[PDB]
């Protein structure tokens, strides 16, 4: 029940600071002969359970994704129905403020924690007694993988492309049947998409997902998210029959094309060059002399040239994954036509890739902190936001339950996870160059 | 065996029913009320056909298998055929003047099997009070065609050629026959076809192998053995094979290719580089052509028009995806390979049949406005009496079982279907211009 305290996965002394791994490396390991495949099985089975929980269960997938934006309801006893300065419905998520990274740090941890708890439930109910200890130890080693949107994907060893995760592009995934070596079962992949049993605009009150406004070429459109049963990447196009919109597909080739063509939304007039997504990410991590406000948010901003802040890169990756053009564009942009959930703040968190993208945004924040350790909400602009309550997330302090604040998560290790790149801090500048340097 | 192909049987209350444009038909079914009986029949019948086992020669897999891989027997007619490269090949005719007539019979086989499965479905699922109405809809149904050269409608004249609406929907809503008012969402059997295992591991002799293809002068083995599902564009070199198991229905990329029309033929010296619509217009309206020139790439055996088979070859490539290996950066937007671009496995994708239904329609249109042009030029006359194996029919005169021959299907109405555009010869030239000019 409530309040639901967010702590990260509990500490076990024989599992010191387990790491959140690159989801492609993790998937390739899990599906190799030298792995027991238990973590993949647990993630798939737990996330499937979470997705199938009912709407009145605040730890259902729908309700956890609902924290971020639409349908703008309460969560954990904290009221929804909030409004923007524009007068428009808004959710709990922070955007365009210096608490963007820290709000999302807690959010990603909540998701990881709920998954872990569901893994433990799965083990109790499905694993032979003599195997539970082994399966429990795998749950305790597991952490939410990140999608490294700036790292070139692996392409074999006998022959330079950014890609959506392997596992995100698979409609089905094979998992273990506990206690039955050699037998796998192919199941719908809960990372491929999220769908409800009806169009999301018809869910029981107060949960219905509405259409969402967007502006394209100086014109307002309604992105028809109310007419979707499933999340989609690029599958919503104007003047297509609404039965296509019900499930417009996971058009991952178009997402990959966008990641590698990097159509930045910003005006890059006077820039020395147009950086790729990997080079922009490299510059984020290596440009010296920046304060926390400049790194963290679009709020700080006439803007700097030849590098981009964390939130601005994140914004572009969202558009490129989900699809950002509903109406038919000009001839040269037809190759990227189509709209989908990840491009729209009110509904992006319904696409399971949301959490993997935000896991890497958390990683980029941790890396930047590591090489800029004296820069934390302590310039004239960002200092005012430092003690904002990160609603709706509760923690125990006092002997009182209170809202999270940014200082509580400055050290991400207090939430009992780490990243390989930040664990080995001595190698960090070399690793940044190896991964993202041109 | 033998399975005697007739077309859907003649019913005096149903004179020459028409094969409709599948997008018009989909809207007729869904858009002005829930007039969904034919849609339900087609979905339920094709689902039954796709779930039949390999030992049933009227299963989807075995019917698609007639065309190409895995190159086995069908209807008591042996496999073991070789193509011009000395490789294993199927019964399908390509690069000969019987290309249109072989495929005319093949599409009719598919339609007839579906109709027969519709009748079984009605017997088993429709209550007495509904039988007349459902039987009437089945007897009216014919296989819809995909008009790849007509702009998709908006709700209004469109601007874009597109895959059929229904082909791009993973799920489809159908009627519950005994329960008027109730409907159910089911997997759409037109969206894709898949087996229960990777197709490369099916029992002998049905396993689908990889298929060697040339790209930019070099050989590649398209990994169709590693697919469980058919795909449009989802097979890319140096992707993990777990992706290849089901590479998706990447219909946006197919639509992009249809509208960019990257012809594989060298059009050096042409007046212009036509769009798909205009190339189709030219096919139907260029005067003074003979059957050999219209029907096949064999005639020229390589001016400002392209023959039926050459257009069909490009559309197959554009729907299925024709680049497995990664191209240069300027062409990345169309990277990816899939079943419809590959003769050995194209028939597994359910759009194959809708495409070939339109190829049949284009042949019927051309025949209508080129009366007398039929296997009678110096080149195509030798092929006129080829047996169209493996297709059997009952010859009523000798009361014998024989293979189909091209002259048996010169009049497509003898197979008891027609096309709206070919009903009135006074109207056809105007309609060609209205649709494609
Ligand atoms: N569409 C936003 C980017 C964005 C999308 C979804 C998000 O959750 C966050 C940011 C933009 O163009 O700025
Ligand atoms: N790939 C063939 C075209 C084709 C593909 C499949 C077919 O079934 C028929 C033709 C070509 O490029 O010529």
TrEMBL record, chain A:
Homology family: Belongs to the tyrosinase family.
One Gene Ontology term from the biological process aspect of the record: melanin biosynthetic process
Official protein name in the record: tyrosinase
Binding site for Cu(2+) 2: 68, 95, 104
Protein's UniProt keywords contain Oxidoreductase: yes
Domain of life: Eukaryota
Keyword Methyltransferase appears in the UniProt entry: no
Native source species: Aspergillus oryzae
Chain positions recorded as Cu(2+) 3 binding sites: 314, 318, 358
Residue window of the full protein shown: 2 to 454 of 616
Keywords carried by this UniProt record: Copper, Melanin biosynthesis, Metal-binding, Monooxygenase, Oxidoreductase
Cofactors: Cu(2+)
Residues where Cu(2+) 1 binds: 68, 95
EC number, UniProt record: 1.14.18.1
Domain Tyrosinase copper-binding per the UniProt entry, residue ranges: 95-112, 351-362
GO CC entries: nucleus
A single MF term (Gene Ontology): metal ion binding
Catalytic activity: 2 L-dopa + O2 = 2 L-dopaquinone + 2 H2O; L-tyrosine + O2 = L-dopaquinone + H2O
């Amino acid at each position: 029940g409530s309040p639901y305290l967010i702590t990260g996965i509990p500490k076990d002394p024989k599992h010191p600071l387990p790491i959140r791994k690159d989801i492609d490396d993790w998937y390739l390991e899990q599906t190799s002969a030298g792995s027991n495949r238990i973590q993949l099985t647990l993630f798939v089975e737990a996330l499937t359970v979470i997705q199938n929980r009912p709407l009145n269960d605040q730890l259902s997938y729908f309700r956890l994704a609902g924290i971020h934006g639409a349908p703008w309801t309460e969560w954990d006893g904290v009221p929804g129905g909030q409004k923007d300065s524009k007068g428009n419905p808004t959710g709990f998520a922070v955007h365009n403020n210096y608490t963007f990274p820290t709000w999302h740090r807690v959010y990603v941890t909540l998701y990881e924690q709920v998954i872990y708890e569901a893994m433990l439930d799965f083990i109790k109910q499905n694993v032979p007694q003599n195997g539970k200890a082994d399966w429990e130890n795998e749950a305790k080693q597991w952490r939410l993988p990140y999608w490294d949107f700036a790292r070139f994907a692996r392409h074999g060893h006998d022959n330079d492309e950014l890609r959506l995760p392997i596992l995100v592009t698979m409609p089905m995934v094979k998992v273990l049947v506990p206690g039955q070596p050699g037998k796998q079962l192919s199941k719908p992949n809960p990372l491929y998409r999220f769908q409800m049993q009806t169009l999301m605009g018809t869910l029981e009150r107060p949960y219905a997902i509405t259409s969402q406004k967007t502006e394209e070429h100086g014109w307002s459109f309604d992105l028809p998210f109310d007419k979707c049963q499933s999340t989609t990447k690029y599958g919503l196009l104007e003047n297509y029959n609404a039965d296509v919109w019900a499930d417009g597909g996971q058009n991952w080739l178009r997402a990959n094309l966008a990641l590698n063509e990097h159509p930045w939304y910003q005006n890059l007039d006077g820039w020395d060059s147009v950086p790729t997504l990997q080079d922009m990410t490299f510059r984020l991590l290596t440009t010296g002399g920046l304060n926390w406000g400049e790194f963290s948010s679009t709020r700080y901003d006439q803007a700097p040239k030849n590098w981009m802040n964390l939130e601005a890169i994140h914004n572009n990756v969202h558009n490129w994954v989900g699809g950002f053009m509903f109406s038919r564009p000009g001839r040269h942009d037809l190759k990227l036509w189509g709209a989908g959930h990840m491009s729209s703040v009110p509904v992006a968190a319904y696409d399971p890739i949301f959490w993997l993208h935000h896991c890497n945004i958390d990683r980029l924040t941790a890396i930047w902190q590591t090489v800029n350790s004296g820069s934390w909400f302590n310039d004239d602009k960002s200092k005012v936001s430092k003690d904002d309550d990160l609603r709706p997330f509760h923690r125990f302090c006092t002997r009182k339950v209170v809202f999270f604040r940014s200082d509580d998560v400055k050290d991400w290790r207090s939430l009992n996870y780490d990243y390989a790149i930040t664990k080995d801090a001595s190698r960090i500048r070399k690793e940044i160059s190896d991964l993202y340097g041109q």
